[PDB]
Each structure stands twice: as C-alpha cells, then as structure tokens.
Write a protein that binds this ligand. Sequence first.
Ligand SMILES: Nc1ncnc2c1ncn2[C@@H]1O[C@H](COP(=O)(O)OP(=O)(O)O)[C@@H](O)[C@H]1O
Ligand code: BEF
Ligand SMILES: [Mg+2]
Ligand SMILES: [Zn+2]
Ligand SMILES: [Zn+2]
Ligand SMILES: [Zn+2]
Ligand SMILES: [Zn+2]
Lengths: 374, 615
Amino acid sequence: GGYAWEDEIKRSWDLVKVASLVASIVEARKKRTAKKNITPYQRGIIRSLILTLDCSEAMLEKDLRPNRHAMIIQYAIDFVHEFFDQNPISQMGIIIMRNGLAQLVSQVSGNPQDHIDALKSIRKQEPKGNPSLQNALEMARGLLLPVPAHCTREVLIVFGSLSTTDPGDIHQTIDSLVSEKIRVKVLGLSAQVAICKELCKATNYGDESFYKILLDETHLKELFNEAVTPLPVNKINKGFTLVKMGFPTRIFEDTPTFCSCHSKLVYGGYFCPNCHSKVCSLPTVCPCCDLMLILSTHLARSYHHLMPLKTFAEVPTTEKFRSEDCFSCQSRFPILLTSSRYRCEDCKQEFCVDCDVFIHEILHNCPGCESKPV
Amino acid sequence: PADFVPDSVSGMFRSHDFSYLRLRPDHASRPLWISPSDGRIILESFSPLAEQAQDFLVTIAEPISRPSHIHEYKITAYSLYAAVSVGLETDDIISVLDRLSKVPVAESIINFIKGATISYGKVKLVIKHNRYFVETTQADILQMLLNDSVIGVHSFEIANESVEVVKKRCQEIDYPVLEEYDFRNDHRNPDLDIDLKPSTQIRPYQEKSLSKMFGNGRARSGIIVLPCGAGKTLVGITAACTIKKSVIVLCTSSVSVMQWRQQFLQWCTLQPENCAVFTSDNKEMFQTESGLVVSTYSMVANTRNRSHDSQKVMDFLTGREWGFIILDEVHVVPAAMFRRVVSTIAAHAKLGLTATLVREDDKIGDLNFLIGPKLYEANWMELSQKGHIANVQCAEVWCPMTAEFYQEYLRETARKRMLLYIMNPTKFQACQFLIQYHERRGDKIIVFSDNVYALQEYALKMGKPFIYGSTPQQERMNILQNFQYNDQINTIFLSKVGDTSIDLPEATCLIQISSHYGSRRQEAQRLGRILRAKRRNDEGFNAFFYSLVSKDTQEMYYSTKRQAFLVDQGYAFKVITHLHGMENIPNLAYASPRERRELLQEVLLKNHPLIRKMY
Ligand SMILES: Nc1ncnc2c1ncn2[C@@H]1O[C@H](COP(=O)(O)OP(=O)(O)O)[C@@H](O)[C@H]1O
Ligand code: BEF
Ligand SMILES: [Mg+2]
Ligand SMILES: [Zn+2]
Ligand SMILES: [Zn+2]
Ligand SMILES: [Zn+2]
Ligand SMILES: [Zn+2]
C-alpha cells in the first residue's frame, strides 16, 4: 500500500527533449474548398428582426469575461452597428427576458441610434429572475404583426438558461409562429435545449443549422456576425411584390425649420417627393404619406448579396503563370515548391492572397473582370 | 577565453566579462544563463521550458534570490551534495545542463561538478541497538577510515558523542556519509499503524516535498524549507504516518507543544493512548510498544540538573532505539547545546522543518552534517499566487524624531540610546493612528516589541492587553482566546515570545514599533504570523505588515539589514513618509509640549510555642 512518494520522481525535465511551407498552403487550399460552393441564392434584403436577449439568473455566471450579461450586451451594441451598416433599409426591435416576463426596450424602427441608447441603458441593470421563451416569442409575434408582407420577419434569440418557465403551452406558440411565417434563430450559451431545437427546426422548414451553441468567446463573435447577412428565402414561400418608395433630394437652407418627424428645428433635411415634408435622416418612413424614403446608395449596398462574386480557385504549380506580380496590387509573389497565385475564372487573372481576401470581403467586384472589354 | 578582442567597455567589468564564449542559434528556447566562473545561473521565468527547469534547477542549485521576472540561482558544493544524493550523476547533469544552457558550460564548471559528484555513495552510517556502526560496502575504505587520526562489508563501532566529529571529518575527507533508512525491510523496530484520515488533503507543493524525501523509497535525513503557513505540520505528520514507527517532535516553545499535538490528533488517526507530551507540566511516558513524544529542546538538551521525574523519562528515551525525529524550527538546532539532542537521541531518520533557514552567525551551514542536506525549498511567491498563503503589503514608515528628544540622542550612550528612540513621540502617533485606522477597517492587529519596557508603556497608556515573558501560560492563553473569539478585543501587544511557531489565523495586520537589532529571521518569522490569514482567498484581500523606524537613527541601519531576507524571497518594502489624514484624528499621544517634556524626563530618569503568643 505504498504511496506515490515512494514510487519515483516525476522528472519533468525528461518530458521535454531537444514541407513546413507546404503545410501553410494546403490549409489555405482546403479552406478555399469550403468557400468554393457559392451560388446566387435568393435573399430577403428587407428584414424585420426582433432581437431577444436573455437577462436572468443564469446570465450571472462567470464563464464569459466579465459575465454573460455584460458581454452579450457589449456584443449586442456591436451587432446593431454592423447590422444597419449592411442592411440600411431594414428595421430592428429589442426585447429582453426578466423575472419571467418579456420587457420591450426598443420599438421596431430604422434608426440605429435609438437601439444603441436602449442597449446601453440595459447594460446597467443587474439581471435576475427566470427566463420565459413564450413571453418573449408572444411579444415578438405582436411586434412583427404591423409589418408588410414583403419584409422578412425574423427573431434572433440569445438564450443562456437550460430551463424555461412559461405560463402557457409553448408548442401552440411555435405553431402560431410557423403560421405567421416568422423565422427564429437561437444562439445558446451552455448546451442544447429540446424546445429551442424544435423551435429553430420547425420554424425554418426543418433546417437544424439555425440553433448554434458557442465554444468560446471568439466563436461567439463569429455567430453574432453571421446573423447580419440576409437569410435566404424558401422556394415555396413566395411573396413577390412591388414596394412604393421615393428618392428625396437633399436641401441646404439658410434658416432652421421644423421637422415633420420630431417637430424639432433642424437646419437641413431631405424633402419627400410625395408631400414635400422634410425628414432629418434616412432611411425612414415618411411621417405624413407613409412612403419609404431612401437614397440610391442604400439600394446599392445590397447588390453584392444578389450577384455574389464567384470564388477564386487555386492554380496548380504544374502549369506556367502569366505574370510575376499581382494584377491589382503588383505584390511580388514569393517563390517559396508551391504557388500562391489565385486566378479568377471569369477573367483568368492572377491575384495575390492579400487581394483575394480583400476583394471578397471589402470590395465586391473583381478588378480584372471590370477591366476586360467584352 | 581564446582569441577574443576586448571591448572598449570591458574595463568596467573587472574580470567578469564572460563574452569570450559564443551563443548558439537556439538561444530563444534555452532558458538558462550560466556564469562560467562564479557558477551563477540566471533563469528566465517568461520563456518556454521555464516550468521544465524550475524543479531541475532547484535540486542542483540553491536560490540566492527569486524576484518576479528574473530568477537567480547559484551552484555550490553543498548544493551539489544534496543533488547527487537523489539518484543524480554527473553525466545526467552535464547532458541536461548543456541542453538548457544558452552559454556553454565552461571547463571550470565542468571540473566543479566532476569533483563533488563522484564521492557520494561509498560510506554509510547505521544504528543498531543504540550502537553506531560506520559500515562500508567495500573493504578498501578500512585503510582510509580506520587510519584516520580523528577516528578512535566491514563494520566498526564509533562513539555516540564522536558522531558530531566524524561527520565533520567525513565532509573534510573525500567521502561524505549519507543517512538512508530502509523502513520497508526494518522489522526489529516496532511499527506504529497510523494513516491519514479521508478528510485529509495533500497539497501539491507538500506532495513534491515528500517525494523529494522518499524518492528512492528509503527515508532520507535532511531539511524541508517551506514558507510560513505552508503546512509544515502536515508534512511532518505525513512523514510520521508513512514511516509507521516510533516518532518524536522537538519544538523550542511551550505553547507550540500543544499546537503540534493538536494538529497531530486531528490530521492523522493516532490514538491518544500512544501520545505523550514531555513538558514542565506533565512528564509521563507512554508504556505501549510504540508511540510519540512531543517535547522541547530544553527538556532533551539539559545535561546537568535533571530531577527524578525527568531522569526516568531520559532513561526511557535513551534506552529505546527510536526511528524518526522531527525538528520543528530547525534553525536553532546547531546551537551550542541544542545540537546535543541529535547525538544523544538515537534515530534512523531526522527531519528539519523551518520557514527561515538563516541566522546571524556562520553556523547555518553546519546543518548539513547535523541533520542532512536540503531536500526541497518552496518559493514564497509561487505559493502566494496559488492561494495557499496570503499576500502582504510590506511597508516601512519613517518617523522623524522631535528636536527635543534628538538633542539627548547625540549625547546619550549607545546602551541607553536604544531606549531613547524607541519611545519617541512620533512613533506613538503613527502606531496609534495606524491601529485605529485598521481597527475601524475591522482588522486583527498584532503589535510586536522586543523591548519589554516599551511594550508596557504602549499598553498602559493605550489600555490594551500586552504579553511578555513573565506572563504565565494560563493568562496569555486567556488573552489569546479573547483576542480571537471576542469582537470587543481586536488588537494585542505581543513580544519575542510569540515570534515563532504560533498559529493566528485571524491575524491580518502587524505593527513593529521596535525589535531585535540586526536579526533577520525575526523579521521573517514575525511576518509569518499574518501569512496565516484565514481569509487569504477573498478578492482584494491584502495583509498589512508595518515597520515603524525612526529617521536619522541607527534603527535605519538595523531596519535595512534585518529585512534583507524578505527582499531575497520577493517581498518589497514601501516607504511611507507621511500618513494621510493623520492630523485630523481627534486626539494623539503627547500632542502638547508639556506632555512631551514629561515623557522626556521620565525616560531620561529611567537610568517556641510559649513565645509565639507574645508575637
Ligand atoms: N493541506 C492542508 N489542509 C488544511 N489546512 C492546511 C493544509 N496545509 C496547511 N494548512 C493550514 O495552514 C495553517 C498553518 O499550518 P502549520 O503546519 O502550522 O504551518 P507552518 O508550520 O508551516 O507554519 C493551519 O491553519 C493549517 O491547518
Ligand atoms: F512556519 Be510556521 F509559522 F510554524
Ligand atoms: Mg509550524
Ligand atoms: Zn426630426
Ligand atoms: Zn412624404
Ligand atoms: Zn494583390
Ligand atoms: Zn475576374
């Protein structure tokens, strides 16, 4: 019955004792394979999202620095800034779950600043109580009722608890959501929840990829970011129509004038082309004729979602190459036996690794393709 | 050093320029720098393999200083003797040293390791029926030992009193002796069946310390150094529990005798029947086959005057052949007569347990042959960050003496000079203000003062309890219990009596108005009292350790010298020139000049049945 002391000494120093360039590429080659599958899927550019955040006792855990509540709210502020930047003509609503009740903190509106203020205020209150998905879903269902049929009704839920207390039958609410064509995305924190999986599956035409559980703080930012892009529409769900909106013309007046939206004096504003009323900022629904007012820039922000740039396929080192320098940035390609050239099939022009990421992430037009004359 | 051009700045380095060697391309990974001449080692604590070499380096090289970032180690002959004991040969050390050293191990360093690494393992000292035999595994040693001018498979007897001489002779001669006990194969000595109860928990650093002692499977004799509050009591208990033989514990205090026994009963499963305490109160000895004796060095080191009650105990101790001895606070064993207990008491294994392994005189190194080499040393900072010991915000408050008192300071002789600046009015204000401030915060304050007269003066005016040598055990215990379990009393005034081996879990704050000259261990041991804080894991907790020192006095010379051990461990002292908010305090001691002058004069003036009915 001897103890571990008498056996031997650990001898930690014994543990430690004293192609690579190809490895760095094959990983790049494999990663390009994942993104090679890109098709012009139809997407609903006009969105109506109801952001539901969990603020309960389970959100007081110390898993995420400093705590789940602070980080989720902190990421929520980031989400609003990114969402409206890439979805200018969409609207957002914010709900929170506290004391087994759903609390409205932001009405559906197209003004990003209003949502930011509400989120910042929520950052102070200490979360407590039990969550209630049914209360949140019912409130989200009501908030999305006064929305046009051409918009995409979506609900993003950040769930942190493993249990839910509801006053009624959750399955009935799930059935109502499907009838109302609302789409629900759930970002869990700890583990899968049976009701959440059913909600995400039955509500998304059986797809099970809309219920995501993070594995670290780095992944959580990726999960939040992925929700900014518009969600592809289902084939059998047809709501095609024409929406009447106008393009106002900016003015520059010498004296201040009252705004028809806030009844506040503002120097400059955009004049509606249907009733001549002035609005401080865009894009917003005109306060008089209920006609959406937007600029041409807002529409152009969503063209890349309808005509995605086809992926760039690697070029094997067996074949010869056209030029020693990048077409767009003329960055000399290191010789390294492997190649770093990325070619666009449409124009067959070599691109460096740096541009390829930039062209497909910041820009949305291939420099070579535009230069090429038909 | 061949064909190396000196630099223009080489003159600044007086023969210490070690740039003659070159650096390999793998310097980014190797975490060890080695001085080719002094043997110094500079270790990077922020590089890979730091934990890989943190234990290997400690075994071979003793630590001179281990501050936050850059650790400093030195290789010495005594350090190597400890390393060679635990299954280490020159080839292994050389191979690992080269594998980890940024700079090549110089021939001088190679020569040093070769000489001291080959002698170990050729002479053993065994004990049989209280008879000491210097046994050797080879016959060649007889021509070297029996012919020694000092002395007097082959085995020959040696006088018990001569052990203290032959062991030094063994160090002087090429072969040093090793004390290894094969408790597994030892059946003659009766065993003691005791095991740690399930409630016990073994901390990793203690587990490492035990492993270093039971590496080869045979109990070693040496010293275990752990920071105050690390749990050395359990380390001794575990060693006693695993050996399962007759044991004894020696401590240089009376109150600590109960503490060790109290910890012994609760941690292990020894029955009260086999435990006997040999102190001034009770002297009964266990008559059972085997047991434990928790005594003090004073009782066992006495030689001249032993009474009948104690004489019988002495015969019982000497007659029987014991197996283990535990020396708590082993930093006082090599004294003139405390070291006699090691030789007089027969034991096959000896363990030393001291938080501080330093002393004013050069007799500290003598511990190598009194009890054995140093087995394991635990870094104070590493345990502190792991939540095992509390963190301390050491501070040094400068209290400038008033002009009136300082006028007599210059003229007064040194002997009375101490008493002059120990009761300066400024220090009273600092001590009172600090005590009140920490009392408001809700801190248990311990005030240390070596000078008994100053201790009494502080307590009498401040109306707080004080403890000093003359107080009895009952009264001091009553004061100690009140200071712990009662909210009314939160501060006590202790003296040199409680400087070592006293457990005060509730103590968090410490103040030292004046203390024992240049002694360093006193500063560290006293600091250990507040390292015992029970609430050492709550967020934001920082124990407070103050040292009030009079400016422009010899106390500064003593103060900077006595805290030279804590700085080596890693603790840094902060200078506090002034305490904010101290003037707004309602009342202060000796505020008016009249009171100050009254103190000055008093301290200066200090130096037939029939006849019975008549009456
Ligand atoms: N492993 C452990 N489990 C529980 N308490 C421990 C442990 N190690 C140390 N302690 C506690 O640390 C304190 C100091 O123990 P002690 O052995 O007197 O320390 P040292 O002799 O090193 O100053 C006591 O409260 C003791 O119970
Ligand atoms: F080292 Be301890 F405080 F006995
Ligand atoms: Mg102790
Ligand atoms: Zn307005
Ligand atoms: Zn209008
Ligand atoms: Zn490029
Ligand atoms: Zn192209």
